[PDB]
Design a binder for these strands. Structure first.
Lengths: 259, 237
RNA sequence: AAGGAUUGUUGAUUUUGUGGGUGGUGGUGCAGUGAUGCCCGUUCUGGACGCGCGCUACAC
């Protein structure tokens, strides 16, 4: 229970953030991250009622000031929830321009962004439209190779889902110097869909976005795999190859040299 | 139509005035809030509360550390089809050809000077000159450090004066070895010229002035075998 | 460059130099899905009336 004087002032802050569009944010709002109980103070400001302009500025303020662990909570509890809410409630299922920036500002901090925005989304019933809009943000903004490689590695272990394939593909399309282990992880991910004892992934129908992602991997990391690994991918193409993309992948894989 | 737009303009102005009025009230609230900024904090700091990671979080951090230790792979571009490579190489041919027709109608030390290069190569045999010059380029590539372009750029001029310098010297004893060096140096000069034509161009124009100046006083005596070589290299480059 | 590059106090997200691809939160017609045919943003500020007489210049 905050002081009643504090509650009234931050209730006045809450009304401000509903209609705020430009200018300087209130001083009582700019100082929230320094507070230990920022979650409770943030609650009285009604984050769900924050204007799109406020979310972008608040995202700037908190990611910069808060620690990696606390900013993760801010991204997950507010930015992610607002991101999903705007998409589902919009008529065309598009994301607002100011919120669209806020995801980039969260990407300023990779670890907090990934476990606060990326992983919770894909592990909480992400939909294709959410993956597409989110994926473009990851595509356009710069990320470290190390953080991206860690993000790519985890995605492979998760059970195959349409949203997960989009996020994996953009990372592959992101044209990184992926560590050898990450490439080896990529080999296992695509290898697990080949029919052998094997799980349903062998027989699960594969959309093109999987094939395009597998094309990107063969496109970019053909010189990065061993001969034995290459044979396994070549077997995967023979068993699960696409009508048109499949021959293209076989060309790219065969053109690569072993490490 | 006249009435409708006036209503539209009136509506736009009306909403504009409301937004300004909302902004006017809005700005006042910050000032009142800012004035009460200290009082709110004095209570808030008094009520500050007294002093495990997710299993996913532990794995993610452990992955980052493990990823740092191991080596990083070189990423490589798509292999273009021979039809695409031919077409792209072919398309570049008209563009270069067409422009020409239009123009027709109207450890290792980088020597900044010619003499410095000789000192570095003073103890080396004639056939080793292509080796030393190439290493200087490798040792001082543009990416390695800032300012290497300028060092390579000046070295382009230095390389030119060297190729003319060798031709002046007698080589009838070891013509075969001498032949192996001039072409090797010239080819390197061609690679350098691609990136540093400005520095070569300035050096080329200076030599022309020097050649003319020596001609005024000495007549044919100033002219040397290298001077014939120099004109030939310009045609090459 | 951690004995500190960059951030509105922060920490490797950026800065300098060198190389470097892409129209892509595109739209729309077809059979969620499709190597899919066709084309190709944001906030404020303002919006000498007519007739007519006479006279006067314009022509080597």
């Amino acid at each position: 229970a905050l002081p009643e004087k504090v509650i009234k002032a931050y209730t006045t802050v809450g009304s401000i953030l509903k209609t705020w569009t430009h200018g300087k944010l209130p001083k009582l709002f700019k100082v929230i991250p320094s507070l230990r109980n920022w979650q409770d103070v943030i609650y009285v400001t009604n984050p769900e009622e924050w204007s799109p302009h406020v979310v972008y500025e608040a995202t700037k303020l908190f990611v910069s000031n808060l620690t990696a662990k606390e900013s993760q909570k801010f991204i997950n509890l507010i930015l992610l929830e607002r991101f999903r809410d705007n998409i589902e409630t919009s008529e065309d299922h598009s994301l607002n321009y100011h919120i669209y920036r806020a995801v980039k500002k969260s990407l300023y901090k990779p670890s907090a962004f990934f476990k606060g925005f990326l992983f919770p989304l894909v592990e909480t019933g992400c939909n294709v439209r959410e993956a597409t809009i989110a994926g473009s943000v990851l595509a356009k903004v710069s990320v470290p190779a190390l953080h991206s490689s860690a993000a790519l590695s985890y995605l492979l272990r998760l059970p195959f889902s349409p949203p997960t394939t989009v996020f994996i593909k953009i990372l592959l399309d992101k044209k990184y110097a992926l560590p050898y282990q990450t490439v080896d992880d990529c080999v296992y991910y695509f290898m697990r869909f080949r029919i052998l004892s094997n799980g349903e992934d062998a027989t699960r129908v594969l959309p093109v976005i999987w094939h395009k992602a597998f094309l990107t991997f063969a496109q970019r990391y053909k010189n990065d795999i061993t001969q034995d690994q290459r044979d396994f991918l070549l077997e995967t193409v023979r068993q699960r190859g696409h009508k048109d993309i499949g021959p293209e992948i076989r060309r790219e894989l065969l053109a690569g040299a072993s490490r | 139509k006249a009435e409708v737009m006036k209503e539209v303009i009136a509506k736009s102005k009306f909403y504009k005035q409301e937004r300004q009025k909302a902004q006017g009230i809005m700005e006042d609230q910050i000032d009142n809030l800012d004035d009460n900024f200290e009082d709110v904090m004095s209570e808030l700091m008094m009520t500050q509360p007294k002093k495990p990671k997710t299993d996913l979080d532990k794995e993610y951090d452990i992955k980052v550390k493990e990823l740092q230790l191991d080596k990083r792979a070189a990423p490589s571009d798509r292999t273009k089809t021979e039809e695409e490579k031919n077409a792209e190489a072919e398309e570049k041919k008209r563009e270069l050809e067409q422009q020409r027709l239009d123009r027709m109608n109207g450890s290792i030390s980088c020597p900044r000077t010619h003499d410095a290069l000789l000192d570095q190569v003073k103890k080396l045999d004639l056939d080793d000159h292509p080796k030393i010059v190439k290493n200087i380029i490798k040792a001082y590539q543009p990416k390695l450090a800032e300012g290497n372009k300028e060092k390579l750029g000046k070295f382009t001029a230095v390389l030119l004066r060297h190729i003319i310098f060798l031709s002046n010297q007698n080589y009838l004893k070891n013509v075969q070895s001498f032949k192996r060096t001039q072409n090797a140096l010239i080819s390197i000069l061609k690679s350098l010229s691609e990136k540093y034509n400005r520095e070569l161009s300035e050096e080329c124009r200076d030599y022309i002035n020097e050649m003319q100046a020596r001609y005024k006083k000495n007549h044919f005596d100033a002219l040397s075998n290298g001077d014939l070589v120099f004109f030939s290299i310009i045609g090459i480059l």
